[PDB]
Amino acid sequence: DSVRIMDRMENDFLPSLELSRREFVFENVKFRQLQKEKFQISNNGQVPCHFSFIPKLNDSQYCKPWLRAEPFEGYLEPNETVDISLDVYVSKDSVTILNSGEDKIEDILVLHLDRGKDYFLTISGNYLPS
Amino acid sequence: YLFKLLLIGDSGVGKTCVLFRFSEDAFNSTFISTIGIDFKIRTIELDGKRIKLQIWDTAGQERFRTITTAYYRGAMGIMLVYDITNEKSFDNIRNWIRNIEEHASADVEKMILGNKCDVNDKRQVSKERGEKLALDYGIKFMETSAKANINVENAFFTLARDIKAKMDKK
Numbered sequence: 001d002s003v004r005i006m007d008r009m010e011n012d013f014l015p016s017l018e019l020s021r022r023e024f025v026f027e028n029v030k031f032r033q034l035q036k037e038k039f040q041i042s043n044n045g046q047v048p049c050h051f052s053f054i055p056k057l058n059d060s061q062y063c064k065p066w067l068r069a070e071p072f073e074g075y076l077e078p079n080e081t082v083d084i085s086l087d088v089y090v091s092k093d094s095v096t097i098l099n100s101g102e103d104k105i106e107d108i109l110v111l112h113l114d115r116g117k118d119y120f121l122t123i124s125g126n127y128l129p130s
Numbered sequence: 131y132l133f134k135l136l137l138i139g140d141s142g143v144g145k146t147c148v149l150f151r152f153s154e155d156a157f158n159s160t161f162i163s164t165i166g167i168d169f170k171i172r173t174i175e176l177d178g179k180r181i182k183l184q185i186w187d188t189a190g191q192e193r194f195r196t197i198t199t200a201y202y203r204g205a206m207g208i209m210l211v212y213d214i215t216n217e218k219s220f221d222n223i224r225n226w227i228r229n230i231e232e233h234a235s236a237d238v239e240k241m242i243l244g245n246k247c248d249v250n251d252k253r254q255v256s257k258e259r260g261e262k263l264a265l266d267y268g269i270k271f272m273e274t275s276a277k278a279n280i281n282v283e284n285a286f287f288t289l290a291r292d293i294k295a296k297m298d299k300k
């Protein structure tokens with residue numbers, strides 16, 4: 001056999017990000033009190049990349065109602081770094097089940113690169129029934 | 131030919147290292163657990179045909195297992211990987227097979243890899259036991275080591291030959 005130059009090139013040119021953090025803990029979440037945890041992503045690849053949080057399995061939205069990512073999609077030039085905020089806000093739609101306990105402060109976000117890999121971010125923590 | 135392959139099995143068994151060995155022909159002992167799902171391209175040749183392998187490497191941690199079943203859909207061949215030094219990882223292979231039966235194609239090609247065969251001092255799973263389980267399910271088996279470069283290339287070529295053979299018949 002011989003050197004797989006084509007494979008080396010194609011792998012090197014696949015979309016890629018570096019994430020500053022993948023595990024998020026929201027301690028003592030309260031009713032109608034906003035908490036934010038930020039992290040950074042950089043395009044450490046050789047090609048521009050489109051990123052977006054996407055629904056998991058057969059879900060309608062990319063995350064639970066009490067959670068948002070901002071921005072939740074975008075386009076990054078190679079070597080470009082942006083901050084993303086994970087925002088937790090429990091309204092009266094989420095409380096019934098958070099006080100009941102058939103839902104807790106847990107979620108997983110799937111960040112997808114177009115034509116590329118996915119990164120998983122894990123959210124944990126606790127709610128204090130107001 | 132483009133074959134989508136998928137590596138599954140418990141966290142820590144060596145999936146990322148097996149892929150790194152096959153695609154980069156190297157071993158790095160400081161890999162972190164996979165938090166997400168990745169893929170790499172590796173081209174091989176069979177019957178004078180160039181076959182592009184697109185190989186997806188999954189997160190084996192429990193909390194991601196359900197999410198990860200979403201990615202089984204396109205798979206044409208699946209490596210089931212356990213760690214010869216971890217009896218639990220081997221016990222779980224039957225459970226991984228059930229996952230394949232549920233979430234993958236009924237005619238997906240499968241292969242069992244008993245990885246870390248370089249660590250025989252800490253071996254918990256005998257080669258005979260691996261072979262017999264594979265036999266029970268009618269699927270191919272071999273012991274591998276991403277560290278010592280044992281059988282990694284052989285495993286992948288074998289899986290791809292099986293896929294290609296099946297496809298040519300139709």
Ligand SMILES: Nc1nc2c(ncn2[C@@H]2O[C@H](COP(=O)(O)OP(=O)(O)NP(=O)(O)O)[C@@H](O)[C@H]2O)c(=O)[nH]1
Pocket residue numbers: 139140141142143144145146147148158159160161162163164165188189190191245246247248249274275276277278
């Ligand atoms: N001795 C030896 N160690 C290995 C071998 N293959 C992998 N390892 C080691 O076993 C540990 C886990 O390897 P890794 O490839 O990350 O496992 P994984 O299946 O990808 N885990 P995950 O599902 O969490 O991503 C690492 O310390 C790695 O260096 C091998 O063939 N021999």
Ligand SMILES: [Mg+2]
Pocket residue numbers: 145146147162163164187188189
């Ligand atoms: Mg891994």
